[PDB]
């Protein structure tokens, strides 16, 4: 009964509403615009991008290689391997660490993925929406002002 109730919730979510489940499997993946994905030189003119560029680049690399491979015509083993690579890379892109291994850039640091910008404190919600730095402001140490 309990399993039926849970699965009924999941399916009736689609059934009652007009949202069909076909949108769960992705044929095209969106690309967050560039300024939310910076690429800026700094210090001695050394360019310093973000981590999403690496993840997007990995997805693109896997995709181009897969397209070529299908076009040339290869045994099912290699095309399956490339599809698996694309899958795990899209997973890392959308959510790094959620599956497989955390894709770690140089220094064995898990690269920030699009999901990471939501979870925890450092995410968007708790850091830049529910509290923001403000102009026309200042601070200093305080002292007792008894003549006030």
């Amino acid at each position: 009964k309990l399993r039926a109730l849970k699965r009924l919730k999941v399916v009736a979510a689609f059934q009652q509403s007009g949202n069909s489940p076909m949108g769960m499997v992705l044929d095209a993946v969106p690309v967050i615009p560039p300024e939310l994905r910076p690429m800026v030189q700094l210090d001695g003119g050394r360019f310093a991008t973000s981590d999403l560029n690496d993840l997007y680049r990995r997805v693109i690399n896997r995709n181009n290689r897969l397209k070529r491979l299908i076009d040339l015509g290869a045994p099912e083993i290699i095309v399956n391997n490339e599809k698996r690579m694309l899958q795990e890379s899209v997973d890392a892109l959308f959510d790094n660490g959620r599956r497989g291994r955390p894709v770690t850039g140089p220094g064995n640091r898990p690269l920030k993925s699009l999901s990471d910008l939501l979870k925890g404190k450092q995410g968007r919600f708790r850091q830049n929406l529910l509290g923001k730095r403000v102009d026309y402001s200042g601070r200093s140490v305080i002292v007792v002002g008894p003549q006030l």
Partner: protein, 1096 residues
């Protein structure tokens, strides 16, 4: 006493007991360990004194362990030997100036040998520029100064821990074997009588499989154990038969997916545990397990890896512990008690010092070296290779370069004092690589385990999120070669306290029975009181018969670090206030006088001398030439030496590092004498602050809730004033559009602003500069849209002062610079920052407070003869803070300032009976000392106060109670009741307001989100976080919140429009939609979540 320092001031002491051992070389923990790493001859001599059997340094160790490298074939081999160090390439000062890393080239004899035919190839290979510890124990990396903080870790070994399960209320004992870079392995005894074999943390296994895997037959197991019910139960219920079957099961479990085979199984087991390639529990670990199990006699240790006998010893010990035997007598080994070790205890928590840390880094670098060379031998043909070809330094040096920079222990040297520098050394950092972290650090690992007594500072720890994780070494503490922290002890042998200072570890100290440091020794080594306070094995404190005692502490204050040991009257301060005071003694800024404290302890001298600031006579001699720049001394035999002085050198935290000579041309200097003062020293003693005349009354509320009132005298006379030196640097680079060049030819600008610049375009030395002024003119190739725009280094907002000095580096001078940098300029601007209201002051008792108001000298309380009080403290902070030690401090300080004379009309007063001679009389301003835990008793202090010599006339300002009659300087009538006045030592803390204040009206904005930046280094705002937003919602203030989150910070169109409205005076427009919300929307959309908006 004598002080044993050829130039120390005759600071009298209240000490009622003698110190059998003078304080060690407080920087011993660093210098001795690093010299062990290097293998210096002095370390060799010390080892010969203390273990001549096995004298071998750290580098020799890592080389021997690595060597001989062998390929899989084994037809050729490689080896290393004889690590030698050359002289340092550049002197310490030179490297600090020109950014060079003070280091020595390292050379090693590499030997490549062919085994198939027999050949040798000997070479002297260059293994990098090994950084070298300076004389003061600080490394110099890239000019900067850094300190490697000693780390604390859990010693590799065997740990039997017992836990009570609530499911059935039963005690189960589990062992845990910690190797150094090995594989984990646990034995558990669960609810049932099943002995676990969890290997690599995998789903539990029975015991019989492992024993059979090791070749132990069922008959062998049964006959070796004919008593233990649990294990016969396990044998019957193991439901597995055959060593081959056991290996099959082990391989299947440990190697899922692999087709099992018996030879592979045995080889894999041996490789995983017994072969010395992946299981290398270090010499410390082997020592620990041998002691815990008593397998071997105290023979030299070379079989670091584990052994079958060892694991069977652990199994039998564990099962017998479950049975509950008192002691275990292992087969063919020394018997030892059956006890459960505790992780926090210092008998099992080792001090991994600088030597071991750099050794580990070298070991990993050399391991990667070994990997790459073993790879190389396959590609290269034999007979066509030379040790030069085999060795590629890139791993090793990288490790070193990656360790000193960018590490959790190569901490940036913090020196705004000498004490801060000293105490940064001798610091035990429980957190770091291979250690615990803040998230996993519970309350259990942070407490003060009763074994800390003498091996750590129970009082001195940070207050932030590090309480107990970062302690300091005790004064007398010493480090065993194994990394344990020894403490000295005096051995009493049947009521005769002897003089053999024997160093004990935690375990040995627990074995014996140790008495307190202060006890009634009857001038002959015997005790008076029948029973004395005494420590037992687990830290318990009791009374024990006097004849039983066999160990006594060397002296009280053995259980306090350098910092805490300088707090006079520490025996009256609650531990929290003492903790805070010991913390802030590391924060006091160095003033321009630095008067010696009027009341202190014995540590004011040694600390200073060990800090290394004061120039010390290398050899005894006669002074010849004295000058502010340098001192030249005639040595006793012909030769001479010149000591060059660092004047106005910047400190790592912006304070000045002046050194001032204190000798004249004719003086004879003895070896080890103090020749020149440091930043905070005064004739050798540590002078962190000033003796100020303090009253303890609440004065008109200005000293309300910890606030401190100051006399304007301290500003007029310049009692408190620091010289904060800053460092501003700019570099001209080469770009595609052209080459940057600093010069006076700035773009359109008035002639009023080039006055300061000299012909080079940089500010003339000595020219005052203020906010908005130009330091180094610079014009940046403008290219396509003058051929150059404006990019001159302007001093940041709020800064000012004189230009101390200008340093220049030019490509034409063939000087080292980053690629593309035509020139580099460093400008020093120094400000003589005065004392200002809002700044923090504090004593040596954590009696902190800001300067609420600096009254004029006239309208302050004054004594009978018109002496204004230089400071006032609130009275409602002494009692509840439980730090009345400061009150006794200021009482003794008044007694020291005025001078006293005990009248021996009828013998000597009884209260002064214990008082030593030379304290019955003392001239005014006679500096004294009250050691930490034995010192000026209350009765002695009262008696001292009862007879103080009149200052000028027949008038004793302070009565016997320590309280005087203060005349209100604001109104004139006397305060109707007395006031507690005295001389208290207080210091200026490095929290000055000029570095704190900040405002913003429109500054830089981030680019991912258009919110304002954050930080004083930029303009930045102030984070209106979430709790503030809850406050605003609670008030109901909606428009204020809206504009605090929309137009002030985020609405990209809103900011310019509201600024325009304010400037032109129109109404403030309506806020829009936060940009950061748009960014959230775009991110969600880029996450394939169709998040749409509509209002209809």
């Amino acid at each position: 006493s004598n002080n044993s320092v050829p130039g120390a001031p005759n600071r009298v002491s209240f000490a009622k007991l003698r110190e059998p051992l003078e304080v060690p070389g407080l920087l011993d923990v660093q210098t001795d360990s690093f010299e062990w790493l290097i293998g210096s001859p002095r370390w060799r001599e010390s080892a010969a004194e203390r273990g001549d059997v096995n004298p071998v340094g750290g580098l020799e160790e890592v080389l021997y362990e690595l060597s001989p490298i062998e390929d899989f074939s084994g037809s050729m081999s490689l080896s290393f030997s004889d690590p030698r160090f050359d002289d340092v390439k550049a002197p310490v000062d030179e490297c600090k100036d020109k950014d060079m890393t003070y280091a020595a080239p390292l050379f090693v004899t590499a030997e490549f040998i062919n085994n198939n035919t027999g050949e040798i190839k000997s070479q002297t290979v260059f293994m990098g520029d090994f950084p070298m510890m300076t004389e003061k124990g600080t490394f110099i990396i890239n000019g900067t100064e850094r300190v490697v903080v000693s780390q604390l870790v859990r010693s590799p070994g065997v740990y039997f821990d017992e836990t009570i399960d609530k499911s059935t209320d039963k005690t189960l004992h589990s062992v845990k074997v910690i190797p150094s870079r090995g594989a984990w392995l646990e034995f558990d005894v669960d609810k049932r009588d099943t002995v676990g074999v969890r290997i690599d943390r995998k789903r539990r296994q029975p015991v019989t499989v492992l024993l059979k895997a090791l070749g132990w037959t069922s008959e062998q197991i049964v006959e070796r154990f004919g008593f233990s019910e649990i294990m016969r139960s396990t044998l019957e219920k193991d439901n597995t038969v055959g060593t081959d079957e056991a290996l099959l099961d082990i391989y299947r479990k440990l190697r899922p997916g692999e087709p099992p085979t018996k030879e592979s199984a045995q080889t894999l087991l041996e490789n995983l545990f017994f072969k010395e390639k992946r299981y290398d529990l270090a010499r410390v670990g082997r020592y620990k397990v041998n002691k815990k199990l008593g397998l071997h006699v105290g023979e030299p240790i070379t079989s670091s890896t584990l052994t079958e006998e060892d694991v069977v010893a652990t199994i039998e010990y564990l099962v017998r512990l479950h049975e509950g035997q008192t002691t275990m007598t292992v087969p063919g080994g020394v018997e030892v008690p059956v006890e459960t070790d505790d992780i926090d205890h210092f008998g099992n928590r080792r001090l991994r010092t600088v030597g071991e840390l750099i050794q580990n880094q070298i070991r990993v670098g050399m391991s990667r070296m070994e990997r790459v060379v073993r790879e190389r031998m396959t590609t290269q043909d034999v007979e066509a290779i030379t040790p030069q070809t085999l060795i590629n330094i890139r791993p090793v040096v990288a490790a070193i370069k990656e360790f000193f920079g960018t590490s959790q222990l190569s901490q940036f040297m913090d020196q705004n004092n000498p004490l801060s520098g000293l105490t940064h050394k001798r610091r035990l950092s429980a957190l770091g690589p291979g250690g615990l972290s803040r998230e996993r650090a519970g309350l259990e690992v942070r407490d003060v385990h009763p074994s800390h007594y003498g091996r750590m500072c129970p009082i001195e720890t940070p207050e932030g999120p590090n309480i107990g994780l970062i302690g300091s070494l005790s004064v007398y503490a010493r480090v065993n070669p194994f990394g344990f922290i020894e403490t000295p002890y005096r051995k009493v042998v049947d009521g005769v306290v002897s003089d053999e200072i024997v160093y004990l570890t935690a375990d040995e100290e627990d074995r014996h029975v140790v008495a307190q440091a202060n006890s009634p020794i009857d001038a002959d080594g015997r005790f008076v009181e029948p029973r004395v306070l005494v420590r037992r094995k687990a830290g318990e404190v009791e009374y024990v018969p006097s004849s039983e005692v066999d160990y006594m502490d060397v002296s009280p204050r053995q259980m306090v670090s350098v910092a805490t040991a300088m707090i006079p009257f520490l025996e009256h301060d609650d531990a929290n206030r003492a903790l805070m005071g010991a913390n802030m003694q590391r924060q006091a800024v160095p003033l321009v006088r630095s008067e010696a404290p009027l009341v202190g302890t014995g540590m004011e001298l040694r600390a200073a001398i060990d800090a290394g600031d004061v120039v010390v006579a290398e050899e005894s001699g006669v002074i010849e030439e004295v000058s502010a720049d340098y001192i030249t001394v005639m040595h006793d035999n012909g030769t001479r030496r010149t000591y060059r002085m660092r004047k106005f050198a910047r400190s790592n935290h912006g304070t000045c590092a002046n050194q001032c000579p204190i000798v004249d041309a004719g003086d004879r200097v003895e070896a080890g004498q103090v020749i020149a003062d440091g930043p905070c020293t005064d004739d050798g003693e540590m002078a962190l602050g000033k003796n100020l005349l303090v009253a303890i009354m609440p004065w008109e509320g200005h000293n309300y809730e910890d606030a401190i009132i100051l006399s304007n005298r301290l500003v007029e006379e310049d009692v408190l004033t620091s010289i904060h030196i800053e460092e501003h640097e700019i570099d001209a680079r080469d770009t595609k559009l052209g080459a940057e060049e600093i010069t006076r030819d700035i773009p359109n600008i008035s002639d009023e602003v080039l006055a300061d610049l000299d012909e080079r375009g940089i500010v003339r030395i000595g020219a005052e500069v203020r906010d908005g002024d130009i330091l180094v003119g610079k014009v940046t190739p403008k290219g396509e849209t003058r051929e150059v725009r404006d990019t001159s280094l302007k001093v940041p907002h709020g800064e000012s002062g004189k230009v101390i000095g200008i340093r220049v580096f030019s490509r034409e001078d063939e000087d080292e610079l980053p690629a593309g940098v035509n020139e580099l300029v460093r400008v020093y601007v120094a400000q003589k920052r005065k004392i200002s209201d809002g700044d923090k002051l504090a004593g040596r008792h954590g009696n902190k407070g800001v300067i609420g108001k600096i009254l004029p000298v006239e309208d302050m309380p004054f004594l009978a003869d018109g002496t204004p009080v230089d400071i006032i403290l609130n009275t409602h902070g002494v009692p509840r803070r439980m730090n009345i030690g400061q009150i006794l401090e200021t009482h003794l300080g008044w007694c020291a300032h005025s001078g006293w004379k005990v009248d021996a009309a009828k013998g000597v007063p009884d209260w002064a009976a214990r008082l030593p001679d030379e304290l019955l009389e003392a001239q005014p301003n006679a500096i004294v000392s009250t050691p930490v835990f034995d010192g000026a008793q209350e009765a002695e202090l009262q008696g001292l106060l009862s007879c103080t010599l009149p200052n000028r006339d027949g008038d004793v300002l302070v009565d016997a109670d320590g309280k005087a009659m203060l005349f209100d300087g604001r109104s004139g009538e006397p305060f109707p009741y007395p006031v507690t006045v005295g001389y208290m030592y207080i210091m200026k803390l490095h929290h000055l307001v000029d570095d704190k204040i900040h405002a913003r009206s429109t500054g830089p904005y981030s680019m991912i989100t258009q919110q304002p930046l954050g930080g004083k280094a930029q303009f930045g705002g102030q984070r209106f976080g979430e709790m503030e937003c809850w406050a605003m919602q609670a008030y109901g203030a909606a428009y204020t919140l809206q504009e605090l989150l929309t137009i002030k910070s985020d609405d990209t169109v809103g900011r310019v429009k509201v600024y325009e409205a304010i400037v032109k005076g129109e109404n403030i427009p309506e806020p829009g939609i936060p940009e950061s919300f748009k960014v959230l929307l775009k991110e969600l959309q880029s996450l394939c979540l169709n998040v749409e908006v509509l209002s209809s």
